[PDB]
Amino acid sequence: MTQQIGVIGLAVMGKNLAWNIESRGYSVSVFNRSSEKTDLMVEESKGKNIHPTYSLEEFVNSLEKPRKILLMVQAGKATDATIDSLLPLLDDGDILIDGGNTNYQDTIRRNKALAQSAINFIGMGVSGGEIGALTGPSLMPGGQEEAYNKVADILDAIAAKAKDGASCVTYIGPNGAGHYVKMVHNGIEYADMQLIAESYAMMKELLGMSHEDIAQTFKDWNAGELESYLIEITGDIFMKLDENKEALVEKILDTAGQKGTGKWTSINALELGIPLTIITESVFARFISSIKEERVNASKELNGPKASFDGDKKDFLEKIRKALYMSKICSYAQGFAQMRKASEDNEWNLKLGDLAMIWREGCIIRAQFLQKIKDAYDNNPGLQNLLLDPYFKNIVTEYQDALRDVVATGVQNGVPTPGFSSSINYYDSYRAADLPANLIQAQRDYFGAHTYERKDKEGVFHTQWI
Amino acid sequence: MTQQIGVIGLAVMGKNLAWNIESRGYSVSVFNRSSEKTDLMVEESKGKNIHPTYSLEEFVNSLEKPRKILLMVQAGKATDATIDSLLPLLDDGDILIDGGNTNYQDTIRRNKALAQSAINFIGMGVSGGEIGALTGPSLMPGGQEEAYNKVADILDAIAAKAKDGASCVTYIGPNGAGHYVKMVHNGIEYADMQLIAESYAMMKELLGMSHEDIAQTFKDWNAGELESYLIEITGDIFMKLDENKEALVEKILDTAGQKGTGKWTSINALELGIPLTIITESVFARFISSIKEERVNASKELNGPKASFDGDKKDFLEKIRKALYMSKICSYAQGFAQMRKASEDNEWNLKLGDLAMIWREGCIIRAQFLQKIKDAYDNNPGLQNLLLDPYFKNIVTEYQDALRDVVATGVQNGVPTPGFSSSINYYDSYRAADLPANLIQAQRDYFGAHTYERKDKEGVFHTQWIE
Ligand SMILES: O=C(O)[C@H](O)[C@@H](O)[C@H](O)[C@H](O)COP(=O)(O)O
Ligand SMILES: O=C(O)[C@H](O)[C@@H](O)[C@H](O)[C@H](O)COP(=O)(O)O
């Protein structure tokens, strides 16, 4: 008479999640304010246990208590509009689940407001794309821990499974913790794609490699430690030829699009005081990407060196490979330092090892790399920074020679390497016992009387320099 | 019996500004809610036309109308609290001037709310420090234009005077444009200091020079095109001694303090879609400087190359100079691109040439470099980007060779150069006709079906990439 879970908003992401839930033996109610999308789902659901509803009242009354309602509607005001309409129809203990690409600060607000109406609110990050939602995504749910455990069985059944069987879902933390770490996953994803793009730019501009050799190189890289979904599809992309047997990717306009999640991570890092240089450079790299016609006009006015390489290209290709793997470690080390601080500031008590665990499959950044981050936190739960992990430390201690060679060669040949440059600069600053920040403190004391501390004496000092 | 202008908040900044005003022949009323500071300044103003008040009602009733009130109260709630209590006592046409380090969005809110009660509001950036506030600071007032004109004489009197005879103050724009431009100034200031810090880092760790040679180099640089207040005081700083013959700068804790305007500029750039890489790296550089204990522990676990240099040090030191000057050009170009975008979105109608004009003196980033920015916009008011100005373009055309050599050398010797690196990366990215964002777009279409556009034909496309 009543279904076990309900899904509002039946675009392709909501349709696929509901179908995923139904494929595991659960009964699902579906509703869409525009009932035409409900009418096509039912025809695409011949045989499936999908119960359509054509009103919020009928939808809510269709669900067993405590009601489990998954919100898969457009982010922003539509989500708040759907919440406000449901609130009069719900009963105490009902559970709302926002699976959209929501800013975590809105989730904090909705969770706080709804809780005063005795209503549970789970903001859940969902990663994996359209195909990921239909077969097994990465799921980052945050909110009331008790309400999570009441829906954990459903989430665990639909989530992607790692090679050790563990489902790629776990309780992240209170209120907005889930949507927060989904935002950080996307920020990490930005840097992964930009580092691949810089490897690609070096192979094309500096080495003059054809699209076939570019694809084969990424495939060879994918058979080793760099194995990842993004590197896999990068190999497939350079295989996709077009009308006249040319690389289709070479005819795509170089203007990188964006939703909020990219700039949101960088803004949050700045607010928290975390040096998220690599991801931020990637976000900034998308900004420069978008002013195409301005760059086209600047290319005719500003000259640079002509890229040339007189050495062994296969040896240098391997240096790019080392540079890519080391830059991932530096980028992830920054992203996990941000989550550690956000956990502390928001009192989320995050378990960073669990985040790497649920990112091993389902999500876009999924890679064997994620298993070694989990190994890092499994070996040392108090690990203060990824660079200090014994395995990762041994890598960057080795690969730094190739990363320096790759950056310096890119700079002398006019090939921009913002992600590579940021990684090596992060490694050199983080390991530096003494930075030139003492001169910054001396200047601020000069013109602003901002005082300073000393390296030998303890206390606060001010100096009349002139 | 009445005064011409009033100052609320008598810490050092509000004090010196009140004394600056009084030094020009104006009558100033002063107030501070904690009367401790008020009693002290009346002792410090023996013989000066300073009328002290000891209640908000007495303060307002002591000023001639339209009343001109300079608020120098702690930013945030204390400033909004002062406005809320002043409002019932004011009359239509009165003018409030907030001169603290205020987030421009707060100024937008206050201005529009107070406009509904016929109260003018001016958010004025103040740059120059305590001494600069006493003699002549840079002033960036934003608000109602006819409210600025009724106080323009006072501001022009107290502002620093460039050697054109022009004062370092202009009507910046409506509402929060004054505090916005002040915020970008501080963001630019962060980068100027980080670039100087990197230049110094290359001298100590790579070239092995000591404080004597480092100081004389910055003075040598300050005689040429790089002449700036910041580079000048750097040379002075590397000469202050421990009284045990040591350079005092070397035993200062390398944990850079920071306040809002630094990260505010980067956060704003990220909201506007502006590539502010150099200022942002400098903000991030201060963050990583703060975890000193985390760094000293990493210093014993993460090794790197032993910095060694064998070539001609004087040629390379000159290369560092060219690297510093070109990095400023890219950094300022990013900052002035941000301001151009911000005025477009806020209809502020900013005149960037006037900004560089009033930063020629009084402010912290003041330098002959800012005459060239003024000369750029005077040469081309529709300048797309400072890098396209013929003078700057010729500089970066030649200096890019040096900046590459410095960045490559520092990278090979483990000396971090985040400002130098992001500047040459900005140059190579801004001038790149074709960037590798085509691959990023292809990937976003692969896993997200976000679709893409093409270079040859036109329209929007989505592709089945794998079979
Ligand atoms: O599926 C995921 O892992 C992420 O959620 C990501 O795929 C996001 O949802 C968009 O697809 C890309 O976002 P941008 O437009 O910011 O690249
Ligand atoms: O006069 C100026 O230009 C500034 O107002 C200055 O006095 C301010 O104190 C710092 O430049 C801000 O930088 P911090 O955030 O490092 O203080």
Residue numbers in the entry:
A (entry chain A): 1 to 466
B (entry chain B): 1 to 467
Wording from the paper:
Two key enzymes, i.e., 6-phosphogluconolactonase (Pgl) and 6-phosphogluconate dehydrogenase (Gnd or 6PGDH), from oxPPP were identified as Ag+-binding proteins by LC-GE-ICP-MS. As the third enzyme in oxPPP, 6PGDH converts 6-phosphogluconate (6PG) to ribulose 5-phosphate (Ru5P) with the concomitant reduction of NADP+ to NADPH. Since oxPPP is the major NAPDH-generating pathway in S. aureus, we therefore further measured the NADPH/NADP+ ratio in S. aureus exposed to Ag+. With the recombinant 6PGDH, we show that Ag+ binds to 6PGDH and inhibits its activity in a non-competitive manner.
More importantly, we resolved the first crystal structures of 6PGDH from S. aureus both in substrate-bound and Ag-bound forms. In contrast, the binding of Ag501-Ag504 has significantly changed the secondary structure of residues of 352-371 when superimposing the Ag-bound 6PGDH to the 6PG-bound 6PGDH. Besides, two residues, i.e., His185 and Glu189, which are pivotal in stabilizing the substrate 6PG via hydrogen bonding, flips over for Ag+ binding. The 6PG binding pocket is apparently morphed due to the coordination of Ag ions to the surrounding residues despite these Ag ions are not located in the 6PG binding pocket directly.
